[PDB]
């Protein structure tokens, strides 16, 4: 219903794509930088000066949600096995990072599936949904890098 | 958000739950009634915007939910086949009544998320409560044991 993916961030979005499905890497997990810790700094950085952790909050539901069910390729399935099995109850916004918490906002959009029953509050919430975009987009040599991905060895492969 | 499930519908989640963990059964997949049909039904019965709304709202939610909230340990398995067997297929293409009920347990918890004004919320549980009603209204043909198997000794392995 209407999120966008900042431009800056479509060319992440392939490299990412590509290091999973292509070059057969995975991302280094548990995170360096998780969900959690992004969305605290976010929350941070608003309160500087029906809010922030409400939208927080939110995010990272719909993050502890979607997961397992529609933010991994096929490639990342066994590793997701195994993240359960290792940290069970542990939610998956203290395991994943930024590049997972972005392919949630290429999903997202459907949820908003019911807030269109309220014109007021969604427009508020994509204002706040596309200010977070925003602020990953900017801060993307810290968040969206290679550096946080290793190429899966043989014995991932082998299952 | 008190999603209350008509009482007529309880015995019935204790069936549900009754097959699959101590009886060892798996519901029948793929459902020979779906998700998408069961709401394309509903959506004919009512018109005859907001249950286009709440049908969409309510696949998305399925879609979403069902692999990691609306099932018992011992459905894993079956789970992970559908996941090769269907690919790509939504979920609410491959499951059917059981499971969909299932969801009206855990959405309450989801959607306590959302922003919603007094109004859009209890206008948002009433038609949740009118798809309830409507389940309930066709339980003989939606929820049965008769869609259950005892699951092979493999599957247990």
Avoid: C
Wanted: net charge neutral.
């Amino acid at each position: 219903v209407k999120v966008k993916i900042p431009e800056e961030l479509k060319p992440w979005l392939v490299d990412d794509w590509d290091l999973i499905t292509r070059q057969k890497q995975l991302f280094y997990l548990p995170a360096k930088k998780n969900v959690d810790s992004i969305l605290e700094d976010y929350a941070n950085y608003k309160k500087s000066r029906y809010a922030v952790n409400e939208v927080v909050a939110g995010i990272k539901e719909y993050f502890n949600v979607m997961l397992g069910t529609q933010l991994l390729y096929k490639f990342e399935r066994p590793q997701y096995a195994e993240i359960l099995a290792d940290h069970p109850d542990a939610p998956m916004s203290q395991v994943y990072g930024a590049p997972h918490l972005l392919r949630l906002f290429v999903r997202i959009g459907a949820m908003l599936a019911y807030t269109p029953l309220d014109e007021k509050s969604l427009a508020l919430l994509l204002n706040y949904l596309h200010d977070f975009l925003k602020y990953l987009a900017k801060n993307s040599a810290t968040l969206f890098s290679a550096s946080d991905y290793e190429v899966a060895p043989p014995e991932y492969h082998r299952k």
